[PDB]
Amino acid sequence: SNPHRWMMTSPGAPMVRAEFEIGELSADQVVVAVAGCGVCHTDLGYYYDSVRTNHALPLALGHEISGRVVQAGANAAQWLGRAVIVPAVMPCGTCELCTSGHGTICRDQVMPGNDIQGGFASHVVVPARGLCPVDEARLAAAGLQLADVSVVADAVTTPYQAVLQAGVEPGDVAVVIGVGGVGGYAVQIANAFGASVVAIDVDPAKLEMMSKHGAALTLNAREISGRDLKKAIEAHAKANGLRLTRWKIFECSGTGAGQTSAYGLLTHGATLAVVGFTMDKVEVRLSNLMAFHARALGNWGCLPEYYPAALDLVLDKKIDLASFIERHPLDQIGEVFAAAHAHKLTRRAILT
Amino acid sequence: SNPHRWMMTSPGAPMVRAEFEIGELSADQVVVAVAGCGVCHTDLGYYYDSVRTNHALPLALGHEISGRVVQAGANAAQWLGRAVIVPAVMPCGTCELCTSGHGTICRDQVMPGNDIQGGFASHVVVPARGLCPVDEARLAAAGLQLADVSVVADAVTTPYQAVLQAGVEPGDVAVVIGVGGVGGYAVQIANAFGASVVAIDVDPAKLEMMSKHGAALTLNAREISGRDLKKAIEAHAKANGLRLTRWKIFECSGTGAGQTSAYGLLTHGATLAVVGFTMDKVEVRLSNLMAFHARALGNWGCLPEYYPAALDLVLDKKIDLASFIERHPLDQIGEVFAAAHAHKLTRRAILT
Numbered sequence: 001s002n003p004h005r006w007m008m009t010s011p012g013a014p015m016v017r018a019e020f021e022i023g024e025l026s027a028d029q030v031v032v033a034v035a036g037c038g039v040c041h042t043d044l045g046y047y048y049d050s051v052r053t054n055h056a057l058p059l060a061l062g063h064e065i066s067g068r069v070v071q072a073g074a075n076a077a078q079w080l081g082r083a084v085i086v087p088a089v090m091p092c093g094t095c096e097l098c099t100s101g102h103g104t105i106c107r108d109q110v111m112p113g114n115d116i117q118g119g120f121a122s123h124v125v126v127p128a129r130g131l132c133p134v135d136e137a138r139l140a141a142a143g144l145q146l147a148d149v150s151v152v153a154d155a156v157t158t159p160y161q162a163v164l165q166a167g168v169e170p171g172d173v174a175v176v177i178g179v180g181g182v183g184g185y186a187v188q189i190a191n192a193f194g195a196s197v198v199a200i201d202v203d204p205a206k207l208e209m210m211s212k213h214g215a216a217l218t219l220n221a222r223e224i225s226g227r228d229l230k231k232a233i234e235a236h237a238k239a240n241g242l243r244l245t246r247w248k249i250f251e252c253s254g255t256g257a258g259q260t261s262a263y264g265l266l267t268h269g270a271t272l273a274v275v276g277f278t279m280d281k282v283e284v285r286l287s288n289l290m291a292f293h294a295r296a297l298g299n300w301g302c303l304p305e306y307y308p309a310a311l312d313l314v315l316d317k318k319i320d321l322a323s324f325i326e327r328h329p330l331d332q333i334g335e336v337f338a339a340a341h342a343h344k345l346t347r348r349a350i351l352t
Numbered sequence: 353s354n355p356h357r358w359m360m361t362s363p364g365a366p367m368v369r370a371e372f373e374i375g376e377l378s379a380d381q382v383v384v385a386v387a388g389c390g391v392c393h394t395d396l397g398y399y400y401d402s403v404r405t406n407h408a409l410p411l412a413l414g415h416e417i418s419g420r421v422v423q424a425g426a427n428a429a430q431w432l433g434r435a436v437i438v439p440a441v442m443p444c445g446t447c448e449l450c451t452s453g454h455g456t457i458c459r460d461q462v463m464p465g466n467d468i469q470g471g472f473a474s475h476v477v478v479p480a481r482g483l484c485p486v487d488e489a490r491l492a493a494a495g496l497q498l499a500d501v502s503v504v505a506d507a508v509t510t511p512y513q514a515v516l517q518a519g520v521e522p523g524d525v526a527v528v529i530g531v532g533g534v535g536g537y538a539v540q541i542a543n544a545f546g547a548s549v550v551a552i553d554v555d556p557a558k559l560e561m562m563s564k565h566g567a568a569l570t571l572n573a574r575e576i577s578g579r580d581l582k583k584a585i586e587a588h589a590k591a592n593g594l595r596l597t598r599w600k601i602f603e604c605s606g607t608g609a610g611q612t613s614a615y616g617l618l619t620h621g622a623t624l625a626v627v628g629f630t631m632d633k634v635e636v637r638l639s640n641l642m643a644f645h646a647r648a649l650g651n652w653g654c655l656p657e658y659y660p661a662a663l664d665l666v667l668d669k670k671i672d673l674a675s676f677i678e679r680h681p682l683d684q685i686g687e688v689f690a691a692a693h694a695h696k697l698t699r700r701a702i703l704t
């Protein structure tokens with residue numbers, strides 16, 4: 001009957017169950033009663049690789065949040081009782097960058113489980129700006145609980161922004177390199193947008209898995225090299241009457257190998273969507289961009305305003321969550337983090 | 353009294369004066385009586401560096417053509433007597449690529465002085481599709497001869513496409529790296545679009561020159577290093593109340609050094625316009641594109657449909673040709689090529 005969180009006090013140290021009181025809410029704030037919260041490589045980063053959080057410790061992690069607004073500041077009453085997905089990163093909505101369509105670079109953006117207390121908790125206080133309403137009627141009809149669509153935040157929306165930006169359209173070849181986590185939904189969403197998707201990875205189990213979920217062709221990056229990789233996608237395109245131009249290539253590995261591979265796949269009018277982050281440098285013919293009249297598009301998370309469309313893909317069964325999602329009790333946060341670090345998990349963990 | 357061309361028979365061999373007959377014209381064809389034709393590094397490439405032309409030798413080079421329609425096929429009568437700029441490269445206008453706004457990668461694009469006989473000639477036969485009409489009243493009022501606007505093709509239009517694509521708008525910092533040829537017009541057009549333009553080069557004469565023609569700041573890349581170069585543009589932006597985000601960086605050097613420098617200048621929301629071509633590979637943190645939500649845009653020449661706007665910049669004196677342009681008699685084609693190879697020219701050569 002008291003709200004509680006599971007907080008990181010220190011990298012590698014045990015998570016601490018800490019009860020708390022919700023205070024006065026500012027005018028634009030709401031309390032969401034967490035249904036579920038996803039476990040991300042970003043979260044494992046903070047905890048196992050000592051990546052600095054913006055908020056000082058102790059801090060409840062978790063940015064992949066669904067739940068219900070149970071409490072609201074003065075200008076947020078309209079949200080009470082509505083089931084929501086919380087945006088993983090929330091722009092101001094009011095500054096010249098936000099208002100000119102550059103929300104992804106708001107100097108005042110807030111990420112639960114980094115900037116503020118996160119969603120590994122019964123309850124989490126968040127701004128009401130960009131909350132994504134969930135139709136529970138449609139949720140039920142898709143055979144899903146509110147906790148399941150928690151991972152729509154970041155895991156679905158991030159690749160959704162990448163694909164929208166890239167302008168995937170029917171007849172396209174799409175290539176996604178690294179087809180775990182973000183990448184897997186990159187394949188599913190590219191496919192929903194009309195592309196014939198080539199999936200590339202080092203793990204033949206994720207390749208096998210994506211065969212059933214929108215990957216019309218799969219290639220192991222350990223087996224097939226650069227020169228052959230181009231020929232094999234050219235082959236796929238020719239054999240299926242698909243575009244030899246305007247390839248939509250999503251780099252979702254976050255490794256220099258992946259980036260080098262993806263850049264090598266550029267052709268006339270191609271879009272390379274850079275989604276994965278590495279500090280590794282890469283050797284590339286930058287001028288190929290001019291030679292092919294191609295573009296490389298970075299993507300920093302996703303504007304909230306696209307969350308409802310990403311959700312509609314799930315609700316209208318145009319993609320699958322359920323096969324990539326496993327609910328766990330929040331009190332297992334310790335065992336789950338350990339399991340996910342040791343790559344012993346195949347589905348994305350949701351804590352309840 | 354016979355039409356003639358100056359043809360490349362063989363790389364490095366003398367140019368040959370060859371007279372010719374214009375036959376019956378197909379329905380969409382016109383003869384333009386050349387007023388002037390620009391001499392480009394592309395032309396020096398074909399002649400001095402043995403770059404393959406698509407049309408077999410012997411071939412009249414020259415793709416930077418202005419002149420007058422003196423003769424027209426049956427469906428092109430309306431063009432007779434009209435002063436024109438010939439597009440350096442003419443897409444089909446009928447293919448899925450041309451019809452979906454990807455004309456720059458049409459596979460059936462025709463370039464005078466490469467695919468067909470060029471403009472180092474009294475006369476050149478070209479399609480009527482994409483011809484840019486020249487207002488002679490406005491031409492006169494800008495203090496220009498028809499021969500002067502020959503270099504609007506490629507030299508102006510190429511950077512014009514790069515700037516339009518990059519979405520330069522008032523409040524922007526623009527950086528152009530390599531401020532000769534294409535680069536110089538990149539500075540002039542960025543500036544006309546409302547940016548405060550930083551010019552970067554290794555030649556202090558072109559820097560001095562661009563100070564007078566839209567470069568609000570100049571930096572010698574031999575004197576100022578990478579780290580300091582960023583600080584100095586940050587300084588320019590802070591001191592002038594300019595955007596510290598969404599920088600429009602145009603790489604116009606066609607050298608790995610320039611590319612490495614330009615990529616290093618990326619910031620939140622930045623556009624890197626890749627205009628220069630080198631075969632050199634470069635080492636870059638590709639993920640900076642995701643971290644800054646930035647984009648790299650290649651540019652292969654320019655859609656004809658934008659030639660009128662490029663010309664309007666010249667006619668309305670919003671940019672300067674005259675200070676960068678020198679007419680020569682076509683019969684000097686030999687002496688001029690030699691002079692331009694030996695870097696002995698400061699203005700762009702037009703042959704008459």
Ligand SMILES: NC(=O)c1ccc[n+]([C@@H]2O[C@H](COP(=O)([O-])OP(=O)(O)OC[C@H]3O[C@@H](n4cnc5c(N)ncnc54)[C@H](O)[C@@H]3O)[C@@H](O)[C@H]2O)c1
Pocket residue numbers: 040041042154158177178179180181182183200201202203206221252253254255257258261274275276277278299300301302642
């Ligand atoms: N752009 C954003 O806003 C954003 C948000 C979340 C994730 N990311 C980044 O995306 C990257 C991956 O995200 P994730 O959580 O899905 O990771 P993940 O570990 O779940 O998936 C990465 C996949 O890449 C595969 N892989 C590794 N090396 C490869 C190679 N050379 N070729 C092909 N596949 C290869 C792995 O086997 C794995 O399936 C990270 O760098 C992460 O930080 C960025």
Ligand SMILES: NC(=O)c1ccc[n+]([C@@H]2O[C@H](COP(=O)([O-])OP(=O)(O)OC[C@H]3O[C@@H](n4cnc5c(N)ncnc54)[C@H](O)[C@@H]3O)[C@@H](O)[C@H]2O)c1
Pocket residue numbers: 290393506510529530531532533534535552553554555558573604605606607609610613626627628629630651652653654
């Ligand atoms: N994208 C297209 O469609 C298109 C069309 C025309 C030209 N180009 C390319 O544009 C490039 C330049 O053509 P141009 O006629 O303008 O060449 P240019 O020789 O007239 O100009 C190049 C400029 O780069 C400067 N420079 C050289 N090294 C530099 C460095 N490290 N840092 C900064 N500046 C440096 C030079 O001093 C010079 O001013 C070439 O690579 C050419 O092939 C492409």
Ligand SMILES: [Zn+2]
Pocket residue numbers: 039040041042063064088153154155
């Ligand atoms: Zn996440």
Ligand SMILES: [Zn+2]
Pocket residue numbers: 091092093094095096097098099103106107108
């Ligand atoms: Zn904002």
Ligand SMILES: [Zn+2]
Pocket residue numbers: 391392393394415416440505506507
């Ligand atoms: Zn040219």
Ligand SMILES: [Zn+2]
Pocket residue numbers: 443444445446447449450458459460461
């Ligand atoms: Zn065409």
